[model samples]
Target: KELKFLVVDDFSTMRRIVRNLLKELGFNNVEEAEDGVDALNKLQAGGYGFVISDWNMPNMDGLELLKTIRADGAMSALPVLMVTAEAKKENIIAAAQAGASGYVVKPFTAATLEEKLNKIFEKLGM
Candidate 1:
């Protein structure tokens, strides 16, 4: 499937990097958001198959955004895959408990991204 993606990060550079990565993975229909708040607004309004977000950001961080999404009735089941530099044990646990579709630590390779995405899709029956 040619899934639509929303790449959210505080840095435009990171967003661009994610866009390129998605393209490498054979997905080109992607959107960019400067922060979690922007991403949530977009997600609430329209069609987006996946969200790739950075953990840290200004005005509503990724974890908070994930919580809000899970709480909302409309987008409660939307897939959220966190891409961050946070590779701590507790952070991973927290993301899983908060209903993330998947989590990938930063400096990751293309293969790692592919594997995590597949795992999420398989588990969710997507």
Candidate 2:
């Protein structure tokens, strides 16, 4: 199925990298957001199937965004995948508790991205 994606990160380079990667994965309908606030705004506008976000940002980080989305009645079930350079056990635990559908550590390859995405799909019975 074709899916619309929101790629959220403070860095333009990272956003481009993620967007391109998703395109390569056959998810062509991708959009970019520079921060969590921007992501939320776009999300509220509707039509996105998934969100891939960076954990750390200047305004409203990924974790905050995930919590906000999950808390919102309209977007509670939206799929969220977090990408972070934080590989600490505590950080991972916190993210899982924050209602993230999937998590990927930074410097990851295409295989790792595909694996995480597939896991989320399987778990959600998508």
Candidate 3:
């Protein structure tokens, strides 16, 4: 079985919402990190299988996290799905360039999350 998911966002409300939606979709294994720094700490501790992160956070942003994860040998392969309000075309391109598995714009519905999650999983053969 896969390990738990890491939900990274600076906003507590958004983190809870993401976690709750994951639970709704029958993904009960989940954890939360406030920002990129905290997220890196948790990821280094191991046991996380997926990452759902937000951009524009303090103490390191989503892009930095993505780059760091990609640079690392052992941790570079996990699926990273960015969930952020930055809808600019360049924002999406930047994430893609940084090796994000998928990207979801903010104000998205549960349907979008689930679909994007499935899409990433399928793309990665997971």
Candidate 4:
């Protein structure tokens, strides 16, 4: 399937890197968002199959975004993958408990990103 992705980050460069990685993985249908609010707006606009988001952002961070997505019945089951600089055990715990489909630390290689994405795909059968 050609999974539509929304790559959210405060930095445009990071978003481009993630979008490029997804393209290399054969998922070229992707969009960019500057923050969680932008992400949610795009998600609400419709047809986004996945979200790759940074944990820290100016408005509505990834965890808050994850909670909102989980709370919204319309897209409660949507897959959310967090890409964060935070490596704290508690941060990972928070993301998982908040319903993240997967988590990858920042400075991750393409191979690592692919592996994490595949894990989510397999679990969700997407």
Candidate 5:
């Protein structure tokens, strides 16, 4: 798809896993960020088609990162998919309210991940 993706997570193992998963899903052009702050910096540099971020981090969380992206004039319309361990309704509502394009819980399978991405892309008309 020629899309650039940023995968943000505090855990190196998780980041690698997500990156590999994306590769398996046919998204080869991907980058990694340790936290939301790092992800935001990368976003500022431009050319990212998507963001898959962890909900918890040391510097900035996924919700805060989503809010920051939405608040920014240039990146407000950027697509963000939150990959969180938190499956609570409140957390999902918060992520949606904060402008997340989609949400995926942890321990997800490849099919589930692909389904979420497909739905998000379809909804965004991308």
Candidate 6:
């Protein structure tokens, strides 16, 4: 119940969609960022516990953001779920290598999102 989420995406519609889905899952505490830089700024300000990010965006992409988050000491362990249109095997591998907690391809159903979130929550003992 304490989890706060940041949803990063360039499109307002997509961001709102993710936000709505999060809310449906009983995660009402959520924020939105237009890009990686915006997301990083909010993250630096603190209190965000999780991130759901799109792969491509203006000014710093999701992969870069994930890498930056992993390298930062204060929030290195923060759970990041890559929700993107990039469905290539390499993309998934790269995100996994970059320390993403989970990866959900775009066009996913609410059930799929819930499953991924629950998997991460269970693994992390959240």
lDDT value for model 6: 0.89
Q: Alpha-carbon error at 51 in model 5, in Å?
A: 0.4
Off by over 4 Å in 2: 86-90
Kindly list the per-residue Cα lDDT of model 5 for residues 1-126, writing each as its tens digit. 789999999999989888888889999999999998899788988999899988888999888999999998888998998886754434777886777898888767778889999998899999
Tell me the TM-score of model 4: 0.92
List model 3 lDDT by residue over 1-126, tens digit each. 355999999999989999988888888999999999999889998888999988878999999999999999998898898877854433777788888998788767778888998887788888
In the order shown, the candidates' Cα RMSDs to the true structure are 1.8, 1.6, 1.7, 1.6, 1.6, 1.6
lDDT of 1 by residue, 67-119 (tens): 99899887799899987785443376788899988888876767888899899
What does candidate 6's lDDT look like per residue over 23-111, in tens digits?
Answer: 88889999999999999999988999999998888999999999999999899999999877854433677888888898888767678
Question: Tens-digit lDDT track for model 2 on 59-97?
Answer: 898889999999988889889988888544337777788
What is the clash tally of candidate 1? Answer: 0
Q: Global lDDT for candidate 1?
A: 0.85
Highest-lDDT candidate: 6
Candidate 6: RMSD over Cα atoms? 1.6
Q: What is the C-alpha lDDT of each candidate?
A: 0.85, 0.86, 0.87, 0.87, 0.87, 0.89
User: Distance (Å) between predicted and true CA of 90, model 2?
Assistant: 5.9
Clashing residue pairs, backbone N/CA/C < 3 A, model 1: none
Number of colliding residue pairs in each model: 0, 0, 0, 0, 0, 0
- Per-residue error at 4 for model 3, in Å? 1.0
Model 4: number of backbone collisions: 0
